[PDB]
Subunit: 282 residues, 4 copies
């Protein structure tokens, strides 16, 4: 008909905080569309200033800052935000929790988390613990429009995603799992391989098409590469809320007790039957 | 919250036709934003081709074409469209009706009519005979979003709009009416005067703020300037559906029987009490 | 060809200041496109914060603030900016000069001035004392693109622009001048009348099509309505740099010595031969 | 400064043809931003109609059409266009040449070729045989802006790109080459692996970061997957003009004599030293 009506949507102080996080994403999206270190600096300040100005925060941890950032008394609220303002088709990642101690909570304590993916469209996956909703940025309105409710990942997919150039450094389980995806012993076709090299792009594909994404421990990086607070926990939260699994290989990512704010952990996530099969290799 | 849902909206074959008219407006809006005779030519062809391709039309009259345009048999449908593809902050104007004879219907036979105004926002006023709805073009979606339902004009306003530089050519009623707006005899303040010089901008302001718009008969143009089929009838239809009045000075515009497709008529329209007061001067 | 190259353009610390003023206009333009008092508040803070952050300013006067705003020592620079952040198809207006005393300079001391007009396109007229250049905002780039260099106004035009609804309050010169535009004594056609009611829209039309714009003294407002620092002086500067004239009726606007920061003055401006003819009526 | 000037750019009837190809890309870009088979159909018709309307074409081959499309006599011109209107972060690919026989020319006869990549930005790589120029679509202007002239690929890169899930079907050379990238025998670090799964995204990364992209012959597809006329030849032309190599494994892609318009061929391309090392494995 070419005609629409619009209706305010609410994820069922946290609202003001998400509002401001989305407002930062909107600004980050416009800066990316018109573009390296400068963008990182700009992204970081947009997020820090909007979150603080929300009057909902007390502690932030940023990928870009050595130490946690304590919100001034006047603007102080009850929430803790861990985020990676520009990661990597690049992205932004964040997790929200209710001192530094307050950002070192297990992922299981997350109250909301999300990621933004800056592609031909800017997409946000968001969850407040009642499932995952996908939104697309409408930059003419400056508003995020709901495109899919309660997104669920496939039980089992047919794509595996990891840097296979690190083969010589793989741990035994990874070597075994990859061998199984290429040479299935049960008569089935081999999995296809995809790896963009930007974690949010790879995680997003994993959510919408199914399969598995891995950045496991290896010989060079025995604790993995990806960061527990503001990369692994938020995507583990999103993927679990969509019915998938996320493991370090030895325990669920959301169960790891953080020991420092820039701690790294291995990450294997995706369709639950693919992750379970990885775990059997471990 | 920064989040919205979208819902398809329907004005309560005509739907396909409005869809295509809106699709032409969308294209015209993009060409205007990036900009004289070339634009006129482009606008006209966008409208003619989209309307024909709708499979809903049989006869078009365009401000830009000497003769009526007969839709090819294959694409033929039941509707007649009279339009001014680029008029004038400029606009597009159209009226829809169910040979040339078929475009020479009294305005009272209109089944749908509308105008688009290309400003900081592109706005469309549309009516299918159940009131006026206002929409704003969202160019990121390529969709028109409902911004106001069942728009009503004020009973009496406080603005009068006409080219007062034609004073020496005014007919007696116009001279008298303008004198009354400047020198009220009842102790009230004088009306303010506004005149953009683009009819859709002036009509739109008249709808949303109230008052009166005039392009009456004068000494130079005893039949007025504005065109009955595709300027005066469509705006008369919109203003009447919003509770205003539109007269030639001697009869309602929608009652004039057209005698040619580019016939001109005088136009006085707006808040009903302002138009009635004009009529008493006649 | 559909292909272009881009080249940085410079008007021949002032550069950083214009950069920031343009960055505020860009933000104001986006807020207007997606829309009353809230917008005013938002516009004002965008301008104040960007200008201060430029490190080029020491004193600002805003239409929206009772008292002048003194830049903090750390961010202090050599320039004074008087502006109307949202005036009124609405606009933004500013003048730059090199305590309050420092914003009370005669318009003749202006070092740069400009206006932005938020229409189907966002247009900026800018001058740094070497003529007027017109730019259009490209919001995809976030950059202002030069569309016309060294804009000149016609010697004499054929449009007059003023609220003729104030006729009963006109001073004698205005009554006489308007009578001459409607009833020329020399056999010529009467001028056309246009008046949008938003000063930047009316001034802009006056620049590009020629003629005259008036907000003179009247019985209700013996000092006019429009504000000397941040409305009349900047547009007088732009129109003079384009070869027109701007008078209060008794002296050039740029020669008036300001006696307070929100002082009003009469404004008559435009094509020089039209303004000179107004002056003879005085 | 926030100010720019624009200047028309020309790649040094072919111009009208590129103009129309770019105009189709512009339309395809807008349809992708607002989004599967429907888009394919829409893309195809946009390209076919714009190219024909250019008055420069006589024969088109489309990925989407079984048979070549012969331009009507009235609109006929001297050029032949082979294109894939929507391939796959997806893309459009085209090659231009000066009956069906006329689209079955060796890639060496190409007079212009290009691809568009629809990401956060819409990018076009274009060459008319004097090197590769990269453009970004400015959708506010509707114009492609030059962002890099005479783009050159690295002599040797450090990324290899192929679906390693097809390992069980690899031919011996591919197995050997991949083994060398993972287990270098010369003490160097292993290459990183990247594979988006959309050929234009993978080719574009290969151009700008260097390394190698492979869709070789395998057991399932002994002639490869990718199509010679409108996928392999155009990207081979672009990569060769940037100083890289493109081979089937047994001969340069641009030297293959086409035997049918939807013929497939193997494709290995990229940095010349990486491609040469692949060839030694063959």
């Amino acid at each position: 008909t070419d005609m629409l009506t619009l209706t305010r949507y609410v994820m069922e102080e946290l609202t003001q905080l998400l509002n401001s996080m989305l407002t930062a994403i909107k600004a980050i999206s416009s800066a990316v569309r018109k573009a390296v270190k400068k963008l990182d600096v700009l992204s970081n300040s947009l997020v820090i200033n909007m979150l603080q100005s929300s009057y909902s925060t007390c502690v932030l941890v940023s990928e870009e800052n050595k130490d946690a950032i304590i919100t001034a008394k006047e603007k102080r609220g009850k929430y803790v935000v861990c985020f990676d303002p520009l990661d990597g088709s690049i992205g932004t990642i964040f997790a929200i929790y209710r001192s530094e101690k307050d950002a070192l909570q297990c992922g299981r304590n997350i109250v909301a988390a999300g990621y933004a993916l800056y592609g031909s469209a800017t997409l946000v996956a968001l969850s407040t613990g009642q499932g995952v909703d996908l939104f697309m940025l409408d930059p003419a309105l400056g508003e995020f429009v709901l495109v899919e409710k309660d997104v669920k990942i496939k039980k089992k997919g047919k794509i595996y995603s990891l840097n296979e150039g690190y083969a010589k450094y793989f741990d035994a389980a990874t070597t075994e799992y990859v061998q199984k995806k290429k040479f299935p012993e049960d008569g089935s076709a081999p999995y296809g391989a995809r790896y963009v090299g930007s974690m949010v792009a790879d995680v997003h594909r994993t959510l919408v098409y199914g399969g598995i994404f891995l950045y496991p421990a290896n010989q060079k990086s025995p604790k993995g590469k990806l960061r527990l607070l503001y990369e692994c926990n938020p995507v583990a939260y999103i993927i679990e809320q969509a019915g998938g699994l996320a493991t370090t290989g030895t325990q669920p990512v959301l169960d790891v007790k953080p020991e420092a704010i820039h701690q790294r952990v291995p990450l294997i996530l995706g369709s639950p039957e693919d992750v379970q099969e990885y775990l059997t290799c471990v």
